[PDB]
Design a protein around this motif. Structure first.
Motif: not given
Ligand SMILES: Nc1nc2c(ncn2[C@@H]2O[C@H](COP(=O)(O)OP(=O)(O)OP(=O)(O)O)[C@@H](OP(=O)(O)OP(=O)(O)O)[C@H]2O)c(=O)[nH]1
Length: 287
Positions: A236-240
């Motif tokens: 999630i952190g990577k994608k956002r």
């Protein structure tokens, strides 16, 4: 926000018990997302067999199928459950009040008393929607001058109902850590002692177990089924783009995002009280 401490608890209990002497029926207001975990832990002692409508509020943010299992539970206890969306708008409330008090007023009619408006009040833990519901039912927003103390009044609702314009506020369940996580995920308690990272882990795992495809599509991620939970945070952190110090994960930001999305029903409409998983807790509480 309300600060509980032993003194405030004793005061709340005493004051609500006193308001209850004034009514024919109590509306116990719970969060449809957690109809059992959003109840005050001493609610049956406080209400003391007063005729009871249980109002599962925020139905728009919950799962109807699971809600119906809780409605059956409340039915089996002798209560009259109804579900509502107090925010988006509730004629069923007066109807439930009439049924809950049917036996009392029949016995009054048999003893030759005149009919009279039913008196009701709303009780529940904080943030479940009590003031929202009262204002909606009144069709207006409920001392305006500083230092002037407002007096409790009756609100005329429909034809047969008089509603106390002031709710009885009781404390949430404190003693169980899982219940604490449920309350934080729904936003009933936006307070401490329950570590937010653990709340987000609980919420993610709930979604992984119960609505995996929707979770993936919502964040546009795909994650190996044998990965540990940290991998979900990282994805999630990577994608956002929630990153710091190069390409390390800003976990605080990811945690806050997951919590916000679950609290505000951004991913889906869930009931976190899974009736069939709570069999032991229910048995412990029942006697
Ligand atoms: N979707 C939905 N939301 C609901 C519903 N009932 C209440 N709400 C919202 O849930 C929040 C809490 O409602 P309250 O009436 O203030 O609860 P109370 O029990 O009175 O708390 P209290 O005892 O004073 O601590 C409010 O949001 P906010 O205060 O954050 O303002 P906004 O919705 O604009 O974001 C309400 O707008 C519902 O049936 N459906």
């Amino acid at each position: 926000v309300i600060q509980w401490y032993p003194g405030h608890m004793a005061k709340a209990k005493r004051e609500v018990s006193e308001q209850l002497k004034k009514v024919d029926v109590v509306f116990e207001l719970v969060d449809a997302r957690i109809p059992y975990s959003s109840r005050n832990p001493m609610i049956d002692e406080v209400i003391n067999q007063k005729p009871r409508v249980v109002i599962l509020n925020k139905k728009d943010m919950s799962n109807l199928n699971e809600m119906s299992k809780w409605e059956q539970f409340f039915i089996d206890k002798g209560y009259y459950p109804v579900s509502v969306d107090a925010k988006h708008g509730l004629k069923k409330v007066e109807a439930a009040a009439i049924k809950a008090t049917a036996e009392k007023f029949e016995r009054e009619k048999a003893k030759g008393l005149k009919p009279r408006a039913i008196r009701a009040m709303i009780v529940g833990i904080p943030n479940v929607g009590k003031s929202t519901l009262i204002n909606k039912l009144a069709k207006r927003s409920i001392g305006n001058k500083p230092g002037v103390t407002k007096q409790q009044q009756w609100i005329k609702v429909g034809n047969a109902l008089q509603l106390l314009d002031t709710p009885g506020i009781l404390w949430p369940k404190f003693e169980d850590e899982e219940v604490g996580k449920k309350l934080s995920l729904t936003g009933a308690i936006k307070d401490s002692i329950v570590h937010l990272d653990e709340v987000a882990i609980y919420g993610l795992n709930f979604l992984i177990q119960n609505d995996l495809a929707r979770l993936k599509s919502h964040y546009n991620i795909e994650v190996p089924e044998d990965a540990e939970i940290i991998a979900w945070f990282d994805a999630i952190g990577k994608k956002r783009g929630l990153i710091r110090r190069g390409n390390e994960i800003d976990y605080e930001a990811v945690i806050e995002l997951i919590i916000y999305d679950i609290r505000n029903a951004k991913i889906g409409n869930y009931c976190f009280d899974i009736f069939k998983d709570m069999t032991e807790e229910l048995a412990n509480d029942a006697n």
